[PDB]
Design a protein around this nucleic acid. Structure first.
Lengths: 52, 114, 148, 59
RNA sequence: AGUUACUAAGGGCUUAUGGUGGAUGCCUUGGCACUAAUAGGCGAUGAAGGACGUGUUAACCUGCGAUAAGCUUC
RNA sequence: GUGUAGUGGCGAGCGAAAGCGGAACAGGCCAAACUUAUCAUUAGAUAGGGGUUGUAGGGCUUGCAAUGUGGACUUGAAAACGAUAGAAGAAGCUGUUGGAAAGCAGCGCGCAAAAGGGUGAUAGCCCCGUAUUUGAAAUUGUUUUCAUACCUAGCGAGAUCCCUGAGUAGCUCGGAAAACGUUAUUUUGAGUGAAUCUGCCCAGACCAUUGGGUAAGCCUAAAUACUAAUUAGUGACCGAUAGCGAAACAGUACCGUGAGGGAAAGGUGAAAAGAACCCAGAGAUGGGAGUGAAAUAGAUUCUGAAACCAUAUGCCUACAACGUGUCAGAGCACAUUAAUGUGUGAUGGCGUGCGUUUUGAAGUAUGAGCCGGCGAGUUAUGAUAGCAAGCGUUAGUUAACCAGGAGAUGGGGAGCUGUAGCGAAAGCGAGUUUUAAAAGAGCGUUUGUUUGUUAUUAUAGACCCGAAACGGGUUGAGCUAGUC
RNA sequence: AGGGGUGAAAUUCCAAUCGAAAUCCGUGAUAGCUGGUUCUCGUCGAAAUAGCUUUAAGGCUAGCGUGAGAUCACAAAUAAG
RNA sequence: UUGUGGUAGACGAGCGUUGUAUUGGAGUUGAAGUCAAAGCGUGAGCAUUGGUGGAUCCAAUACAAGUGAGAAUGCCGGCA
RNA sequence: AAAUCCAGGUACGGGUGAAGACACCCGUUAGGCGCAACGGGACGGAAAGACCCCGUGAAGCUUUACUGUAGCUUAAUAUUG
C-alpha cells in the first residue's frame, strides 16, 4: 500500500502472482481480505483517519 | 452454461434396476417396467407385513385346536379355562412349541382340569 | 472474515421452481390448478377485467378538475412543529438551503404554518401566515414580515 | 404498470390507504326517486375491503 | 395307487463372455458475444459473382489467368 | 420531470412540452434600395461592389479609429506520433518410478519476461515466444509550426428619402405531423388573396393591453446509431443430437420444373514403426511372427454403457387356469461390499398395470415398442407484501455522466419517497369539506428511507407443443383447359 | 397468373392437392379448448355453494384452505336449564 | 400432552449437477468413466474394492444457472 | 418387407363391476410346442370423425343486415369569353 507509486515497486513485483502493489484509491474489500498479509506506508495513516 | 444430466440419471436408473431381480420376461431390463414391478412388489409386501401375521395367528389357532380335539376338549373351553380362572399369560404361539416337546402341553392339560 | 466461511445471519430464502416434482415438493403445475384459463399460457386476465359484469371504474361517476391544465401554484410549506426541534434562527431561503431542507437551484414561495409555542426567539420571513401561527409566534415575541 | 386513466380519474387516494368516490344515480335521470334517496346519494362514499384490494394493486 | 434313476424338444432366473449398436467422459483445426483501435465501399483502366483454363504432382481443393500454383521493382 | 398535463366507443390503450442536470458547442452566405460596365443600357439580361438584419438594420452624404482577428479555408515545407515485414531479448543439474520425466525427492539460478503454446506423463531456467529496448526503401493517417493563399473587421453625425424574401400568409371546404382521435402551431388538393417593418404575427378561440422575436431563400463539423472487414485481446459462453444450417471438400448430396427447403457424418499411436515373412483358402481375410510400453492401440482405427443376439456355470418346468410378484417354505449348488449369506423356488397365503382427464378407471377411455440423448416457469423495466441490513429524529438517496483492470468506489443533490392535511377548485390549515350553523357527520390529530432475497403481478411471443386462415412480395401455361 | 386465368358452366382445372395454387415474410400469428410440465423428505388441509355475466367447458367477489399478526374471557364451540 | 390417512394447494426443511472465487488434498505407485460386487443411508445420494482407461479431479464455504425426464398420437440414432 | 404394439406364460359358464371381462368371485375343463386352413373375439389394424353440440373459431356465397367503396349519375366551382 503505497501513496506515491514509485518506479521501484511499479517496475518490479509485476512477475509474482502471489504478491502485487496497489494504490490506496484502487483497493477493494475483497482484495483487502484476499491478502492475509499487508504492508501499509505511514503517510496515508492520517488521510484514512479523516475519511473514516 | 448448458448443463447435462449424465451421471445422475444413469446412477439412479441403475439403482432402481438393481432394486429388483428375479422377474419374468422383460421386467428387469427397462427402467420403466422395473419401476412398475418395484412399486407393485412394495405395495404387496406392505400388505403382506400384516397378512402374514394374521395367517400365522390363524395357523397357530388351527394347530392348537388339532391337539385339543385329539385330547377331547374344544379350543373355546381351553381358552375359557385359561381366562376365567387359573390366570396364565401364555401366547397362543408358545403353546404350539410346547406340543413339539411331549409332556409339557400335556402337563398344562392335566393342570387346567383342576 | 475470509472468503471461505462468509455466511450472513440466516438470510437465504426458498424459491418456487415450477418444473420438477410430480408428487414431491411443490405441485406439478402450482398456482394454476387444472382445466382453467389461469392454467393455460397467455392467461393472467387483466386486473380490472371482472369478465362478465360491468367494471367497477365504469359504474361510478368521475371527479372533474376546476383548473384545466393545472395542479396548483405550488409553494413550499414550513411547519412550526419540526423546525423548532431544528437548531436554526433568522430563517430565510439561505438558512433553509443549509440543512438540505429546500432546493438550492430553484426558488418557490414559502408559507409558514402550524401552531406550537416557541421557547427560543426566532424571526420568520414568508409570504403567507396563519392566525394560529401568528398568535404562536407572538407568544414567544417572534416577528414575521409580509414578503411579496 | 401503466395506471389506467379511467381508474385515475374516478379514484382519488387518501391518507392511511383508502379511496373516495361519488355514488351512482346521483347526477343523472332520476325523477322517480324520493328526496331521501337524492340527499343520501349526495354524500361521498368508499368501497368495500374486497374492492379496496382489487383497486389497490391496479393503482 | 406312490415314492421316484434318467429326463428338456425348449424355455425361465443369477452370473460371466463375445458381437451389434456409439450414450457417457477427454480434448479439439472451429463457432458466438463483446472490448480497444483502424476502417467503413467497390466500379467503364471493366466490379462483385461466375464459366473456362493453367501441373512432371492424376482427381479434388487452393492460388493464378494465353506471362496461367504466377512476373518485375524496392 | 413521469407514467405528469391531458387525449380517447372519456373503453382498450396512447402519451408529452416546460425547467433542471448533463455529452459536445461556430455560425455564416445570396436575393432585396444604391451603385459600375456591356446588352440599339426603351433591356427586363449578363456580369461589378455594397448590403445580411429586430438591444431594428441596411441604403444616401460627410468623420475618424485600425490592417485587428477568425476560420468551416487554397498549397509547400518542417516536427512528432504511429501503421503495413522486424530484430535483440535470463536462468539446472543428480537420483527414483516409469516405454518415455517434463513429474516426484536433494542441492540450485534468473526474473521489467513464474502472459501463453508445443516438446515421449503435470516444465519460471527444452524450445517458440512472452516484459523491456529498439528498427522503414515505399505507401500512408493524425496533430502541431511557419509561409502561400481565400475570404474576414469598430465607432460616429444629418434624416420618417428609399429598401428588408409574392400566388406570399391567413380566409373556406377537404387531408396529414404534432401526446390530441385535426384546436391554437406547421403542411397542402381545390378557390380566395394584403402590409412595407411606423407594420406582421405569437402567448391552445377571440379582441385590448403587456412583453418577444421578424415568417414567406441557402449551407454548416460536435455529442449520435451501426459492423460485413482488418489487428489484438477478452469471455464465472459450446465442446461435435449443442454451439453459425455448415469444427470437414456445405449452402455440397438430395428434394421439387421453378421460387424455395434441406441434412448427417472429429479422434490409431510418443513416431506409422500401417503388419517383412510363414500358414489355411482362386480372394478379401484370419491365425502366428514382427514394431511398439500396450494390438481392447490394426486403418469397421480414444473409451463402447443399455435396449438387442448367442454362448456357458448352477438350479427349475412338460395334470398346467397365471397383472407373473409378494411372505413363509423343501432340496441342491455353493461361501460372502463378514452377513441372524447368496442363487435357484417343486408348494401353500394373498392378488386386478403407469401417467391422463374424469362424480366414478385393472377397462370394452385414451398415450407410450423398448433403450440412449435432447427436450417446457427465465430476463428487462415498474408495482405490492414478507424476511434481513445500512442509515438517521429536518430523513434516506442517487440517474445519466467524469475519473479506472470493457473494477467496486470517489465526484455527481439533478430529482423521488416521507416531513400536514382538507377540499373539484378558489382557498384554508391542526384544522378542512357539506354547512344558515365552528351543530352533526366524513377525512386529518406528524411517526421513517435506500437496499439483497423471496411470492404474485403490468408490458414485452411471456409454462411448453399444436390450427383451419389473413394480408404483402415473388414463381409457375412444359400436366390439363382456352386462344393463336 | 391468383380479392386472377381458362372454362359446351359439374365448383372443372391452373405442375398428382384448388370454394381460390405454391412459395417467402409480417409470423415464437391468435387459440376461454387437447396433451405434456422431470430432485426429496416434513406440517396443515378444502370445494363442486350464492350472486353477476352475448354466461353455461369460462371470469370475478363472497362462503369454503393455508401462512404471519392481533383478540384473554367481555370472544367462539362443547353441556344442561 | 397432542399427535404424524391425503390430491390440488400453502408453508417449512434439504440433496444432487456444471462452472466460478479462496481453501487445502489426490493424481502414471493409475483420476474421470464404466461393469460387477452378499455396503452406508429418515431422501434425493454417499461410499469400499476388483477387471477395462492413460489424464485430471475430490473435499469444507458461498456464488450463477441452457440446472434434476415416464408419458408429450413427441425428435434423433440404433435394435426386437 | 407393414401398419400396430403398457408389459404378459393369453380357456370356458354363471354372477359381478364405468352398465357386454383372457385376469374380478364361485365352479368347470385343459400334456409342452408346431403345421394348414377358417374369421368369433381381443368393442382388431387403417384416420384427434365429414347422421352433432358447444368455439362470444375460420372459410365461401346471398339479399330490403350494418358501414363503406369501385364504378354510374347530378349540381356548384377552376381551366373558361
Amino acid at each position: 500500500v503505497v501513496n506515491t507509486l514509485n518506479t521501484n515497486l511499479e517496475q518490479s513485483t509485476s512477475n509474482i502472482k502471489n504478491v502485487q502493489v496497489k494504490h490506496l484509491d484502487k483497493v477493494s474489500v475483497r482484495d483487502l481480505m484476499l491478502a492475509n498479509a499487508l504492508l501499509v506506508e505511514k503517510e496515508v495513516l492520517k488521510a484514512l483517519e479523516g475519511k473514516f | 452454461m448448458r448443463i447435462k444430466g449424465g451421471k445422475q440419471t444413469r446412477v439412479r436408473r441403475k439403482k432402481w434396476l438393481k432394486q429388483a431381480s428375479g422377474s419374468f420376461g422383460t421386467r428387469h431390463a427397462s427402467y420403466k417396467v422395473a419401476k412398475q414391478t418395484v412399486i407393485q412388489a412394495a405395495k404387496y409386501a406392505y400388505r403382506d407385513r400384516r397378512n402374514k401375521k394374521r395367517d400365522f395367528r390363524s395357523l397357530w389357532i388351527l394347530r392348537l385346536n388339532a391337539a385339543l380335539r385329539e385330547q377331547g376338549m374344544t379350543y373355546s373351553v381351553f381358552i375359557n379355562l385359561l381366562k376365567k380362572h387359573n390366570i396364565e399369560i401364555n401366547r397362543k404361539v408358545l403353546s404350539e412349541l410346547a406340543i413339539k416337546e411331549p409332556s409339557k402341553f400335556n402337563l398344562i392339560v392335566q393342570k387346567v382340569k383342576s | 472474515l475470509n472468503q471461505l466461511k462468509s455466511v450472513p445471519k440466516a438470510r437465504n430464502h426458498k424459491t418456487k421452481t415450477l418444473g420438477r416434482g410430480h408428487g414431491s415438493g411443490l405441485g406439478k403445475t402450482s398456482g394454476r390448478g387444472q382445466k382453467g384459463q389461469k392454467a393455460r399460457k397467455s392467461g393472467l386476465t387483466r386486473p380490472g377485467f371482472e369478465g362478465g359484469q360491468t367494471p367497477l371504474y365504469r359504474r361510478l361517476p368521475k371527479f372533474g378538475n376546476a383548473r384545466k391544465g393545472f395542479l396548483k401554484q405550488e409553494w413550499v410549506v414550513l411547519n412550526l412543529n419540526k423546525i423548532a426541534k431544528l437548531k436554526l434562527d433568522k430563517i430565510n431561503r439561505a438558512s433553509l438551503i443549509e440543512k438540505q431542507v429546500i432546493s438550492a437551484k430553484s426558488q418557490l414561495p414559502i408559507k409558514l404554518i402550524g401552531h406550537t409555542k416557541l421557547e427560543k426567539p426566532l424571526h420568520f420571513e414568508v409570504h403567507k401566515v396563519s392566525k394560529q401561527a401568528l398568535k404562536a409566534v407572538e407568544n414567544a415575541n417572534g416577528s414575521v414580515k409580509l414578503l411579496e | 404498470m401503466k395506471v389506467k386513466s379511467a381508474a385515475k380519474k374516478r379514484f382519488k387516494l387518501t391518507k392511511s390507504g383508502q379511496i373516495k368516490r361519488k355514488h351512482a344515480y346521483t347526477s343523472h335521470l332520476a325523477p322517480h326517486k324520493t328526496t331521501k334517496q337524492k340527499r343520501h346519494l349526495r354524500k361521498q362514499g368508499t368501497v368495500s375491503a374486497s374492492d379496496f384490494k382489487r383497486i389497490g394493486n391496479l393503482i
